[PDB]
């Protein structure tokens, strides 16, 4: 039996740190996909 | 996050491993050092 908080497992990521990296990463893709273009992110499509 | 004790990784059939229960609350801190990414095939390549 579970003794404690009744909760589902969870993963924490700091909003500031992930974003800062994202801003730096998204610029590297534009060294290939071109100076100016729209890059949208989305979760997994589907599968196992 | 979801928890699964019985796993078949690497598309293994014939052998399934059961992850044994752990006493107390588990806490872990790791570094995220990189990603595995895929690009969509729908194009509209010159758009986004």
């Amino acid at each position, epitope marked *: 039996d579970i003794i*404690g*908080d009744i909760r589902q497992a969870h993963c924490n990521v700091s909003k500031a740190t992930w974003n800062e990296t994202l801003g730096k990463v998204v610029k590297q893709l534009r060294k290939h996909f071109g100076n100016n273009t729209i890059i949208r992110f989305a979760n997994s499509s589907g599968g196992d | 996050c979801r928890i699964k004790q019985i796993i078949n990784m690497w598309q293994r059939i014939g052998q399934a491993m059961y992850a044994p229960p752990i006493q107390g*609350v588990i806490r872990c801190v790791s570094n995220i050092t990189g990603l595995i990414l895929t690009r969509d095939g729908g194009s509209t390549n010159s758009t986004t």
Partner: antibody
Framework: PQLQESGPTLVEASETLSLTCAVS??????????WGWVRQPPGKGLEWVGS?????????????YHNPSLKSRLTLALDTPKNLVFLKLNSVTAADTATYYC?????????????????????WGRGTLVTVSS | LTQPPSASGSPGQSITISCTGT????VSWYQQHAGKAPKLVIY???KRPSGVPDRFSGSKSGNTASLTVSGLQTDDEAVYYC??????????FGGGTKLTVLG
């Protein structure tokens, strides 16, 4: 399950009141209930003192609850191996004179959300009278 | 919590004592005989504990909580306190209701 209170029945004013509860038939390690005290001044109503529990979560080494008014002058402690409860009151006055009962707190202790929520005392002790005089 | 100061009834009659200030369901009632230790006669509103007669029933309507004792008897003469959890983890008690089954 029996709760036996022990300590000085006569304490001088401004001194430190110390009381110790000895549990029998149950373990203080059990996460099903909180352990604390409830004092009842002579011919008066029931007042909540506080309770604690070593059964913790990932961000703490336990839980300890103090009554906002009595918080400053009290200290709560639990001995898990020896199965004992402790209460220490600093700077005690004749106003703190009461019949002290050893209390077991039931509630949302065994399955809580966020913090644990103890709401009612299921098991009581016989209690002793402590008179504070200067 | 506001509990009525006194309450009286004849043997066999049913008494209902109230309590107010409870916004939650953590309400519980206690019975303390004079010169003795208090005993919990009810918890989580209506729910009864072990070795407690059916005639004791808890009830809460709106901001008002109520305890009901039917079929009064000599041993029912005592002081009855109510209590409930409030806010995060603090708990408070009412003034208590004194119920007497004296002659």
């Amino acid at each position: 399950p029996q709760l036996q209170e022990s300590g000085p029945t006569l304490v001088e004013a401004s001194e430190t009141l110390s009381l110790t509860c000895a549990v029998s038939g149950d373990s203080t390690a059990a996460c099903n209930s909180f352990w604390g005290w409830v004092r009842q001044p002579p011919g008066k109503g029931l007042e909540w003192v506080g309770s604690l529990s070593h059964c913790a979560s990932y961000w703490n080494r336990g839980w300890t609850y103090h009554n906002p008014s009595l918080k400053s002058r009290l200290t709560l402690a639990l001995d898990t191996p020896k199965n004992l409860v402790f209460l220490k009151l600093n700077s005690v006055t004749a106003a703190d004179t009461a019949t002290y009962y050893c209390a077991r707190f039931g509630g949302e202790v065994l399955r809580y959300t966020d913090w644990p929520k103890p709401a009612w005392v299921d098991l009581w002790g016989r209690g002793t009278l402590v008179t504070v005089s200067s | 919590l506001t509990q009525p100061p006194s309450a009286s009834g004849s043997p066999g009659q049913s008494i209902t004592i109230s309590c107010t200030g409870t916004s939650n369901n953590f309400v519980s009632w206690y019975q303390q005989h004079a010169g003795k230790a208090p005993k919990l006669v009810i918890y989580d509103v209506n729910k009864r504990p072990s070795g407690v007669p059916d005639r004791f029933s808890g009830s809460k309507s709106g901001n008002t909580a109520s305890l009901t004792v039917s079929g009064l008897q000599t041993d029912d003469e005592a002081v009855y306190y109510c209590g409930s959890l409030v806010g995060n983890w603090d708990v408070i008690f009412g003034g208590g209701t004194k119920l007497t089954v004296l002659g």
